[model samples]
Target chain A: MEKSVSVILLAPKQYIPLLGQPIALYSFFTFSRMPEVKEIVVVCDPFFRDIFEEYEESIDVDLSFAIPGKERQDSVYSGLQEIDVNSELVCIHDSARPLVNTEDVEKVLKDGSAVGAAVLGVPAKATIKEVNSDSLVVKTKTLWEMQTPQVIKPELLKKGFELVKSEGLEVTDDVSIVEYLKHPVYVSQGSYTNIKVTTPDDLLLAERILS
Target chain B: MEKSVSVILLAPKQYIPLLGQPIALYSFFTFSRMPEVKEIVVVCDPFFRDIFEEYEESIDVDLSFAIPGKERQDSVYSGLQEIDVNSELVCIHDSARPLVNTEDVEKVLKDGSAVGAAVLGVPAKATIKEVNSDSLVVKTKTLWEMQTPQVIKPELLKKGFELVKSEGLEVTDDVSIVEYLKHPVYVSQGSYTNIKVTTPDDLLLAERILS
Candidate 1:
């Protein structure tokens, strides 16, 4: 039950160079360095399989690939199908967010082992308000911003995917999938440095944080 | 209507060293360099007033101090009272948030000139959610995370403050004062690097961003 499986997603821009390395390699190397993560399934197109060959010898864990589907939910489900049955835990991460350290991953994994589902997140630094373009509503500081390396039980992961598929629900994060099944997701504290690289500005911030 | 006034808030930890300078000076220097920012009112203790004297010749802008009260709103009101009547706009910023540059401040000021109130903010990178600690409700990308400096017209700022004071409402940011008056606020774009230093970890991130 100590052995874990990780799914590192390859969204459209995951291969963007950061500090002379592709963004995905940050998360890939993070999982590869962990002893608990015995298997890593990189969900991408078949054309990208050759990129994985170079790093195969570097990591002791089993590395595999899964063809991505049209939707992120579908792509995650594809990766979910590729995990080893022996893996007691499953961790899902977006390659765009390259700052999640191995220690944060280990914390989420431990909480997942105890509670079946745990999400790494940081408390909202600013008071968050629900507002529209023309109007402002109420604001509060009680909310937490979700992050990744969301760890969940293998059986529960399987169940969440099946439920969302049948119900035709479009969920954003893996934590939401478990939430759909009425599971309480344990909130593991994460860093503000954990940013998603969607723009050049974001990449610059990531480079600074990594430096 | 072109001349601007800035109120730089010095909270309890504003004296903490960052790089070689105190934390509040980052915002102080940012405002001092802008031609439009004619006067800056720093709200802090009399003991801390000596701290600003050393940097008097460093910039051309008028620098003054205000005595802080038990509450943040009260302290801010004291600073608001210190601005020149000739100043067309009032800008409120927490000096702990040290990374806001002059260009973003100019943008917010221009928007504040066109509209009654304008706030510098970034679109939420992560999907925001409203939920209890034990359960997830729903999440959306429609939200925007607020930052400083929030620029406002002097007349509108005066009205919002009086209303909030009458209601005895405790608000967090200066923009919330405008929101309470039902006056629409223009969302001006800001950088993600513009983070508030609240913890040692935050200071480290601020150091990285500044470097």
Candidate 2:
């Protein structure tokens, strides 16, 4: 019995268009190519189901859809429900981060299989300053910028999500949820090109990177 | 009398070539176009003087050269020496960050003139985590990524540099030195394209941004 990994890709509820395609399609294509990804669950709103259904036929890998929750954690939880109960590891990624490389995804998945949890991130090239509410510099530290495809043990993710439901905690990343549960998530170095396409400028940069 | 600013452009000690131009030339051209920039002092190694001299004829700014010291602060101090004694404000920029826009420059200049110190920075879009030496997440906070064109009053900059000389401090950016001196260095929001071209990928991105 080989270790099986599932991916939960959080697509935006509203159709956030990019490069004449839905932003979610990039990650869908990326994850589909990775042999390690046994299953991929795209958590999106009901409105985009047809688009995803049409795109799904083009890819070779099996993809299932889930209705997204109000928040990212909710959406991820929804996606987790659709994952096989026997899955060894789960990868949570943002569709907005379309530039995620398949190699990096595979790397993090391997690390997760070995270590129980792992995430892709890039080392900070510039000095990072913590600013106070008054906009004053409180402290400065060099930190790694967190990227997506954060992998974790399926049981651990379930436990973490259960705690989130009980505690109503807010987290920005899936790794944070695991970290909140006192789990050690190892870092897998990612590239600078793994930028999240949030703004028009980011979309333009992504276009250039893809080109 | 109208206030005037001089720019201390920190060119590399050796020629770090990018896009078929000396990395410093991009910033040189950027600062030269600003009507408010009265003087531009490029700090580099003595060996690069002839190369800079050759490129000088192609630009119309009041260009001067200074020998850089072993460290970046030392280079900046050398450039400071060449600035006019009566200069009101000084803008310190990295020659490597060629994509710095003139509009951001002016914004920082105005803020620096009014507030005594200012620097261009962008808010972190991702979740920023403070990882320990063991690479464990200790804390998380949203931080601003510090960029260059750190503008300051000449007197204040002189004082900060003197403090560096007295204390043998290792500072990465000009704003940090000012912050160490207990000065309020305001932030001028900069663009994502205002990137410091450090690696081959960065050079590619720069080429795309320029294109």
Candidate 3:
């Protein structure tokens, strides 16, 4: 049973134009422990496949490409069709997240295998406060710091994507999709090093991590 | 050149207090490396000295007892009288604290020797909250969780006790006495295992520690 996991690199042309090469390289290095991760599908512009193939010589995992229409869910659904029937497990890893360790990846896979879905996270150390528009803290302790690679059964994940698209919901991350389905998901402690590279300061932190 | 240091037991009488004997036994058993510790003094009720003398068979370190009148500061002042003229460095160790490691003790002593005054503490993991009478959190900050065996130069420590007594100020710990004088005090990270046997719950925790 080839448990096919795909790392969805949601790098649109306008968002992260230079992210393709680094995402491919990072995915290969992180998942080197689990040799079962067969295909790494990058959801980007249609012309980006040639650019990904140039890095495939250095990468251990196979490469595939998909193009999103107008929405992020459109890209995820388009990519899901390309995955093989033998694909048992689907792990939605953020391409922006390059520092996710091998242990974190394995934990997500192991937990998802038992319960159909799992997410990586750490318990909040500070008292979480829900702030109003005026920046005053109103409500407290109704939240947790959620991180990814959120693992789910491939068919279940596709079902979640379909529900989001049909309902016209513009939610970010795969966990939101699974939450809409009323599926029971488990949370495990995520590493401090696994940071999402978004802003300019975050890119500097990512470079510092590499160094 | 004598440095005056004091050990203050905060609990009330009739507790079968762990004042003199147990502290001496712990020092003799664990402290094979440290050569600077010249004497071990215990401050308790005057009636407890007869019970303390039973440990003479087991201990070789210079042992003495002091009877406190009304407060913890009173015990500290009485303990100061027991110090010899040649004693330059004085260590105030908690008798209830049996888990004070020899390495941490030596470190605190050496730091105090270098810096004139020092106290043993550990870095607090939880965020420190200053709660008011109205049950509102005032401030949160990084804090060091202090424990005992506070090592210091005798004159400086003795001067602190005299200042506290003359001013009629309520002092919580011996460090507060030094801190009132604005003396530069160093904090050495003490072991987590070094705990004070205070309440019945504390005794259970200590038994768990011993087990």
Candidate 4:
């Protein structure tokens, strides 16, 4: 009963236009669906602080803001530090990954309490192949499209950030940093609806999905 | 706009228990979503006439009923004959297949008008194998489980049915009958939820899916 989770929404300013109007609003909606989440931290550009402030009264969860850093990892580390330590679980998510379902987030958080870490993904739909320079088929492996929010124990995630920063290592995602330390991260089947909004076509697909 | 698509719901007595309670309601709901349908003919046991009558008031389309034969083919054939001659397109459906969505039904009906026939199927998730007399694996083939409604042009369907009886050939499903005549039939991807409830476990799954 004491287990509570904090959701850190990564929304650096440079990615906002590609992410569409008010990326944090979509992130807020995703996190608001989970009643167990204690707080939502939005990391955004300094210029968008006023825009983010206007939404504070509209959302249900405890909303806080942080200035964006040069990289995604830096922004996440800053956002996690500002959250209340009373939250036992930490869920790191990208606003671009708008399709993250509340059911999946809850499952990952619950699973991470025992397993230390968990992430979301979809199994590759086609027979994947690696091609050579001559267009010859080279190799094939069980590849999956990775998604987030990656849920982790608060202490474990904090240790991940500390280790990465101390060792001067560049990690792409939160799970990668944890995995480097030999921490086991389980991959759960993600819903097909949760798509990362990157290109123009993806935004069109989002509209159809939302409708 | 003058195209008349008649829906025949094959509900032989063997299929009634498979329909369950909420799932039965959901199946009716899914069928009702198709405004293009002109009439719905339900083929079931005489005992289920009362139950079928109850659904008549809620659905907007014109309703008719017929009794099913002992065999699955005969049951479908009986329902096919019950349709009025004015009907241009005929959709043969199984009452046990509840997960058939309105879009998929409409797609099949529209495509069937152009292609003469189409059947719904989902690619099987697990590897399927044929066994020898000693239970050794002889071969494996890519297999898919077929679902309904199988849509066809009415005149072609009637001709195909007569050919089956004339040849003294016993086969399952409307698509198989058309296949025997060497008529080309198109295949559409059926949804994973469109399960044919054959057993008690399937009934339980239907209840969960409907919920």
Candidate 5:
């Protein structure tokens, strides 16, 4: 895989303190360790620039800030806008998941380079059910539960967002964009430790995984 | 809900030490705190009776031993055989999931008594991919991933297993048995902290969560 620019989305409550640092900083810390990551783009208000800048002395990578849009898909488009033209691939991450290590990112990035779109996740060990409009389980199957950092070509992501806007659709993860374009998104296995820290209990769980 | 008998399945590695205690003891600890639970039947070789007997005084619950069976469903049947005729409901739990707490058990138990079968789990937060026999992603959706302790009427469970054995069906969880019989299994929300400690990382994670 070529040198990549990483974009991290800072959703609400992501700025909250966890293990003496904001949850978003964990992604930054992991990215700092990966040599392939040259520049970083944070999708949030520039008012938080000072907060990100405070780590300049610690982490070596250059940082850029992109103004966030209302929806998550919109925010991702904003983040994509900040990528440098020299970059070959882009890594999109959720700042809430601090347990993502550099090894998993490196693995997914390689897969993305070869497959065009790749995601990291664990096998959905539990039985899954398909519910009807009446909320009845119509079917059941076990499958993959997706996670980040999802690595994709910048061009594909840009086109996906354009299609998303023109069609007025809501999207969840970055890889879903490519999948909608009829492109196959490859799945790579990541640790079960990489949980998205949305609740108070999740914050503590992350703390334990890291410790 | 009436007084219930709890059955803990000690699968391979579940007997491994976690923190200062074996992983199975955590479920025992949780069950002891609930007033609704009067007896516990552990589905493993009774050769470890001395091990479970050690905590009998501390937990203040009557303990019974049941011989292990070849499969999980069989093991469950063995445990069910130990339950006294007075038991109105049975709580089946994976000993690997030390994170099961008393309140969640009570909630699921109530739903089970009312609906005949109930389970505990969290909403699957990721985009789920359905793969074909060739392991290709055919479709994607978001749904629920179940966990335990799954509460069910013992009679329903016993009958479910008879159907399971007669049909020679391989099953994963207890509620699936009821689901196979076209009986509805209600879902109850549980804390995300309730993770099954199946991996090496999970053992340490449980230790941290418990600590």
Candidate 6:
């Protein structure tokens, strides 16, 4: 059987206006170029569905949309529902992190398919200091700074999301959902250019990186 | 008595060639602009002393040179020995981090005077994951990425270096020497622009930031 893969590109409803155009479009364009990506579901607010639908017609890939929930994981779960039933692998990515290169995306998808779960990240360039609530330094560590796209088997993602729903657990990233379920998620080297666009400074840097 | 502050700018002997001119010159120029900075010592290899000395005559501030030791802390200690007897505060900075703004330097110096020890750092923007020796994930944390100049009272720095010598300690930064003696080192917010120019990529970013 041919291995089928889908991408759940989470485009948070709140950031659409600030991004000027649909920031998710960048990820949509990138994933569409990948022949391995059988389907791409962009999880966004219901109001933006029309705009995305307009874009869907212009792309060659099987592009679809799903309504985002209150939280990030909720949005991701909604995206997962829209994935094709035959999809063996799911790539979860933050549309805000548009600088994610195709090379990293391909590597993560390939690794995830092989190992069941994998993520793209970079080793911490600076000394990592853990601070307490009082803002006192508690510990120092060498750490990996996690980025996306985090790829995993759909069954594992479904199981992890089920646990999240049952236990009322909150996670910052998709891999954390699998980590909570005691699964080993493999790591792939990612670039510093793969920055999430959160601030105006980040947007400027992204523009520079693209240029 | 008026408070006097001196900066120990660690210009590691290795980077002078790649930097085009002396990498330490940037920090020297920045510290010279600050009215509060009483002295600035550029710690480099003995071979670079004549080169830095030539630049010193051109600058208006009390700029001098000190030969660096084998390690970073050793270089800092050598710089410390040359500080004026009346100096109350010491600002330990990496010359490679040339983008550190004067505002941050003044703020750290003022904070160090008030608190005895203070370092400039930025909050971790990414999810920090601790990895073991074999490269398996151990823990995840919210951390601060430490930057320079780490400001301290001259007495405290002297004490910290004494402890370092007595215990044969290897430290990555000057603040750790103070932290070893159980002194509270406060963190002042720093800019992302203040990056250490260690790699070719870093030089490109520094050039961009400067431009």
What digit string (tens of lDDT, one per residue) describes model 5 on residues A1-211? Answer: 3346565444456788887888788888788767888778887777677777899777867788888888766777788877888777888888878788788888888888887778787887766665444333454444777888878888888887778779877666424566677766777788888888776667656777878
Judged by lDDT, which candidate is best? 2
Rate residue A157 of model 5 by lDDT: 84
> Residue-wise lDDT of candidate 2 within B110-162, one digit each (tens)?
88888888889899766767666766556434478888898888899889878
What CAPRI grade goes to candidate 6? acceptable
Residue B72 in candidate 1, Cα distance off native in Å: 3.1
Alpha-carbon shift of residue B198 in model 4 (angstroms): 2.9
Say which prediction, candidate 4 or candidate 5, comes out ahead on DockQ: 5
Per-residue error (Å), model 5, residue A120: 1.6
Candidate DockQ scores, in order: 0.22, 0.34, 0.02, 0.02, 0.27, 0.33
Chain B TM-score against the true chain B, candidate 3: 0.78
Q: What is the TM-score of chain B alone in each candidate?
A: 0.88, 0.86, 0.78, 0.83, 0.87, 0.85
- After superposition, which runs of candidate 6 have C-alpha atoms over 4 Å from their true positions? A12-26, A33-35, A45-61, A170-179, A197-211, B12-36, B44-61, B69-71, B98-103, B139-141, B170-179, B193-211
User: lDDT: which is higher, 2 or 6?
Assistant: 2
Clashing pairs in 1: none
Question: In model 3, where do residues sit more than 4 Å from their true spots?
Answer: A1-211, B1-34, B132-134, B165-175
- Over 4 Å off, model 5: A1-38, A50-62, A85-88, A96-103, A125-142, A171-179, A193-211, B1-38, B47-62, B85-87, B96-103, B125-128, B131-138, B172-179, B197-211
The model with the greater lDDT, 1 or 6, is: 6
Q: Write the per-residue lDDT of candidate 6 for residues A105-190, one digit (tens) a residue.
A: 88888878887888888887777677656555663344788888988899999998889779988777424567686766777788
Candidate 1 chain B worst ten-residue window by lDDT: B133-142
Write the number of the candidate with greater lDDT, choosing between 1 and 4: 1
Write the residue-wise lDDT of candidate 4 on B1-211 in tens digits: 3338788887732334544453344555566657777788878777767776787777877778888898876777888877878887888887777677888887777767877777676665522332234322232123445578888888788777889779877664223466566555666666877877654545556556656
Report lDDT per candidate: 0.75, 0.77, 0.60, 0.67, 0.74, 0.76
User: Residue A178: error of model 4 in Å?
Assistant: 38
Q: Of the pair 3 and 5, which is ahead by lDDT? A: 5
Interface quality of candidate 3 as DockQ: 0.02
For model 1, what fraction of the real interface contacts is kept? 0.26
Q: Report interface Cα RMSD per prediction.
A: 5.2, 4.0, 16.3, 15.8, 4.1, 4.0
lDDT tens digits, residue span B50-160, model 3 = 545676566545666667657655666667778767676777765667667878877787777887876777655432333334322232112455666766778897888
List, residue by residue over A84-110, the lDDT tens digit for candidate 1: 877788888888887888888888888
RMSD of each: 5.7, 5.0, 17.1, 14.0, 4.8, 5.1
Clashing pairs in 2: none
lDDT of 2 at A123: 81
Candidate number with the higher DockQ (1 or 6): 6
Which 10 consecutive positions of candidate 4 chain A have the poorest summed lDDT? A132-141
